[PDB]
Write a protein that binds this DNA or RNA. Sequence first.
RNA 1: CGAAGGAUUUGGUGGAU
Lengths: 64, 49, 334, 201, 388, 49, 263, 121
Amino acid sequence: IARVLAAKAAVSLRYDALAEDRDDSGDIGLESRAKVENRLSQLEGRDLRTTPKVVREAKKVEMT
Amino acid sequence: EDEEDIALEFINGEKKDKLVNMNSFTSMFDNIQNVQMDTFFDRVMKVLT
Amino acid sequence: SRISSLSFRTDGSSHLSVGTSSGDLIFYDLDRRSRIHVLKNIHRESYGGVTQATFLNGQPIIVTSGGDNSLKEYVFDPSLSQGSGDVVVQPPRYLRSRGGHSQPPSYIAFADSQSHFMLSASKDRSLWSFSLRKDAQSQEMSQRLHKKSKFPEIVALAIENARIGEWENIITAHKDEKFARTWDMRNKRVGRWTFDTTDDGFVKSVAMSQCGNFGFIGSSNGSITIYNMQSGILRKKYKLHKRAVTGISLDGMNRKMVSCGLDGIVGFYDFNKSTLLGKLKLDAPITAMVYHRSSDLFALALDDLSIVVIDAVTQRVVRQLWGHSNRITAFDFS
Amino acid sequence: FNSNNDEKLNQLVPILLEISAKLLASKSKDCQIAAHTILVVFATALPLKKTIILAAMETILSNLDAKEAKHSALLTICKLFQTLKGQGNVDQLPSKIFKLFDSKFDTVSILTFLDKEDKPVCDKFITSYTRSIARYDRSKLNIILSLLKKIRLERYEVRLIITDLIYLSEILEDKSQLVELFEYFISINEDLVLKCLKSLG
Amino acid sequence: DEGDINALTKILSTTYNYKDTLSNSKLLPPKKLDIVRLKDANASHPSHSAIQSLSFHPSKPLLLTGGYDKTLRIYHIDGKTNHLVTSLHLVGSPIQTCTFYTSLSNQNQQNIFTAGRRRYMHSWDLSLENLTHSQTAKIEKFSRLYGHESTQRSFENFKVAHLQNSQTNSVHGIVLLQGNNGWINILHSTSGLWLMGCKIEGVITDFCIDYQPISRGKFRTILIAVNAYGEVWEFDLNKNGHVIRRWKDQGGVGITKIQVGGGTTTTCPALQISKIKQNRWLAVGSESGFVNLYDRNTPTPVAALDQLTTTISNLQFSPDGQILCMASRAVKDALRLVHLPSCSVFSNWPTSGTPLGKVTSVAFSPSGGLLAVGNEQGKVRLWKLNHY
Amino acid sequence: VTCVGKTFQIYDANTLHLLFVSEKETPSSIVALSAHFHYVYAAYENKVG
Amino acid sequence: DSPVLQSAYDPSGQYLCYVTVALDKQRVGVQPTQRWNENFLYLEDSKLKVTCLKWVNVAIILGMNNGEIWLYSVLANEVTYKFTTGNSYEIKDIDLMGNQLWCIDSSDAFYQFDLLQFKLLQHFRINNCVQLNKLTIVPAGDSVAQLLVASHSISLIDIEEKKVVMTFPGHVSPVSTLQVITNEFFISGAEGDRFLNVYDIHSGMTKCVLVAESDIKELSHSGQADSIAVTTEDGSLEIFVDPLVGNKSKKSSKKIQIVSKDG
Amino acid sequence: NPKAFPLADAALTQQILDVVQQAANLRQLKKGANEATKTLNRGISEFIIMAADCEPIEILLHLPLLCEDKNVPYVFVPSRVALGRACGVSRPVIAASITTNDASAIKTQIYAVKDKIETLL
RNA sequence: CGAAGGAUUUGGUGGAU
């Protein structure tokens, strides 16, 4: 997230610095967050540990 | 006119649609809390369209 | 659909097994008025699908049979939910089965000197191994290929056991196939080597040495090619016959070779020194060959409805047999 | 547990469509449109028989009382016919389904549905609905003219509509609205009208 | 225990099959393609060089193959034997491309045009009994450009189209050529006369032809020209090859070729005036591997297919134009089939085990849904789309 | 118990291992089989064995 | 293999009808043997295949895998009428005597048609006939009283009794030809076999076994057992001179080949 | 896009993209805005290419400030999709830099376009 | 090399031991 956030910070920054007619709204910043937040969520949702599947052993069946 | 021409006419009339992939509705869980579920259906159609 | 069989489950579950001539077995839950599962193509539709399907009394195993020479058993495993088990029903699992050729066997051969197993080929493109004891065991040779639908029906086959267990020990010829496939008894699987006629002729005869190191292929164009089983590499090729080679044999001493073809000549060769010992011409085309290694005598099925016996040592006809009223399908030495 | 395997979607369909039918059965408006959310995805994910597509509308429209579900239902029903891609893709709805749809969705309601610029693609349904009007209701023929102007239908769909209306002229009495429907086809794409007339009379 | 709402529950019970049968459906399935391999064409008589070009006969069941062997080998594609009808060796004429031609008006007229990296082009009259019966052949060499020799260095790249002279309403064939500097030279198919010329800025790499019907018995031919590795053009041939439209392909880099389909074209020629149809698809390839697809009905591409990553040396639509095959000669197995209008690549085919080799030529049969793919090894493999 | 041409074979369901076989071949192909405890009824042509 | 999937001379022997597959569609064409007709009937669907070809005295009757029979007038170049059986099983063999027309399905069901009336007369199945690849009608008078049917053996059946009258031990492979050379003498041949068995209809004993150099494809008989011409699989033609006169097994007397000047 | 100045004509962009492709194969190319900045920091950038259609254009306007400080030529191309395609990547690139190498096989062409961009500036 | 993928591991059953 630090790498991603730093990249978007430059995007938001340089609009703040180099814009001639910037609106004092932060819209470029607002949209940048949703990208990082979405990046965080999918990264957060990832599980490093492998899931165990439902064990289904074909147990022995003997006639009664 | 011939029936084959009419067949190619059907085929030309047909139009594309947005197919559904595995990673199309994963983001719904992210925004599943405190949302009017009508709005959830509207988002479903928006992604589907 | 057409109903062919019906049966209920008597294990305390209100289940009905429904069979159809299409080869499909369906299960219904009468209490819930729903379909539990459908078992597809368990038996061939061409042979009547599921002729009979019966639940074993007081039990979750169902026995299914058909006209395709197959008997199978399926078991309903217990549910994986401690609650609502009736809703949550495991699909049927294959338990055990018996089967054989779906069509008359084409060729047969005795697997071992002990006479416990037999190898069998049928027009259904399947190679089966049948036990001759009370166990009545039967298995299908695996056609999964080695890597470095069923194959066409076998039109010639031979087996050896001097070299079982370390490389291939079977050679087979298929109908309308320009090469022969090798198989291994010990692995019960198709082998890793393929032998081609190299003359654009169809394989008509397959033969092997007693030592189990050489594989012999007779082509329809009259060429005889020799491969080594362990490496499947062509070593020797012979060209004397101009018509199809209908029989190849080699002595146990691995010295003198005999070949026969539709052109009616019997070629005698020295395998070791690779020379033409002699050539013998018969009145009629030769159809098949059986070589008795111990006595060095071989019989030939001629188109004049006769069996001509020749001694390889002296290359002369020793006995001729008459009496058959039509072509001779097969023959063997005691 | 399936996803890409197309064989293995099919075993879901017994399970989850039965769930959708039960959800439609629930009087709760929330349950019904949940089934609308469920149904729409499977139609696009897997093509389904028109009979099943037809049976779904009968269940959707049977307990359709809530206004919000009425909005959701009309989006689903159009989408399901969009997925339909076989002969009878735009064939007329039967008598019972047509009666059921108009009762729950008056003509003015769909005219508003066509009116909005953001309307989803529904030309196949409107073609199917358009023919159903001509077969069963003679008074609504004027509404067909309004519907066709609102929505641009596919070329073959326009041909098929022209085909039925040619039969209607031979059977049903000539009317000012009917000739206007023909004159509407005269104004737009003159030549295709002649082809329908040439092939039929 | 022993419209209605429970209708849906009922229909689920009736059947356990839920896929709508594709046999009734006339549009092929989106992601699943039903293809079976058949016997190969060149098995009967192998070619000794790469297959530079393939072409199906418009009506008869014949296939034409050419290559640096300098031989025009013709095969009777039957799918099971594929025996060779006739062959022609042209000494000193490497075959870079070849094609059948049938006069739109005179169905009896049949001709094959072939050329290479040479300053001449050969014509092969198949009319009457020449194809099979005749002991000796009728051939014509086109080697005169009528004062435009500077613009053209070789005849290796060409295509054959139909031109209708509106002032007389007569229709005749035209041979199209690629010039040195954006030049397109237009020649008469039969007489060989130079008719008109079209020029574009930059290096011409490829061109294609589209037909626009006007009325009963009236149609217009449109020439489209593209640049190596980004840029596009267009012309109008029935008004003396003047420009009528300009546009740029968005993201215009990569480009190697251009093609149109959904109507008449070289692979799907018409047999009469009424059969002429407009092409609703336009695909522009690339050596980067992208394919910008445009709906002919500045433009915005509908999709940018990016499955392939190499020289797109062959773009071709199906005769009825719902499938795009995009293939490359750079490396092996570099062939993909794109469904239209979904613009989704089929997954089941091709597989790793699919034998394609260095794909160098592809051809779609006018009917019967046959796909022929040539490779650098001189081998043409045939397939059948079960849907057609 | 399963019919095999002119003879029948009885298999043990535990293992599908053959338990018994018909002592002789029937003159005609068996049409129906009914099993009851130790006795199995085989029908061929106009005779039931 | 040959491109010509199936073929048949006319009874006069002056015109040959052959079927070939163009792309994936079979086309039926007729050419004059004695001496080009560029007109072929085209099957509009790939799945459609012709299983049987028989001449009618100028129409040719075609059996197909669908389960119906087409009557085709070569002059007009269209199918005049289509005889459709109730079932969809493919037709294995067909034979004709005047108005009488008999065909068999892969379900092993016999069917009878009338050319003049365009009607199905009867359809029956006879036990002990598990398979049926060959049907031949015996030439007795001007009516059909018996039928010869073969799958791997040969069987003779009576129409009125609807039962087998006699069985002959045939080849191991499926029977490919069942032509009746004369009365009480009909030849039989099987796929992938070099031997032809001539059987006596009344007695049932193999009079002779004619042996060819290689596998047989087609058979032609001249007069009344005067001569038999058999097309071998290798592409050679063998002629049997008086096969109905050691004695059990006979070989070809004359062999004919075609080779180009080049070789 | 008034901020993007100078903007190359149709002809020049074709030559620039051709050089960009050759640099990509020779691994002479650093693609992406931030890499372009890194090259100026070391002074290893021979010249820098930017896309005018980038939105917001502000995210690349800093490179001109760096470029003029270090006397390195720079140019603007109309399409960002075209530039990234020329780079040899599956994604659009708003900025790219040609690294300095006097031992490269494409030095003459690179120096040629640099002169044209210098004239454009 | 190559007809609708390849590499490893593993549950269950059957047959021998």
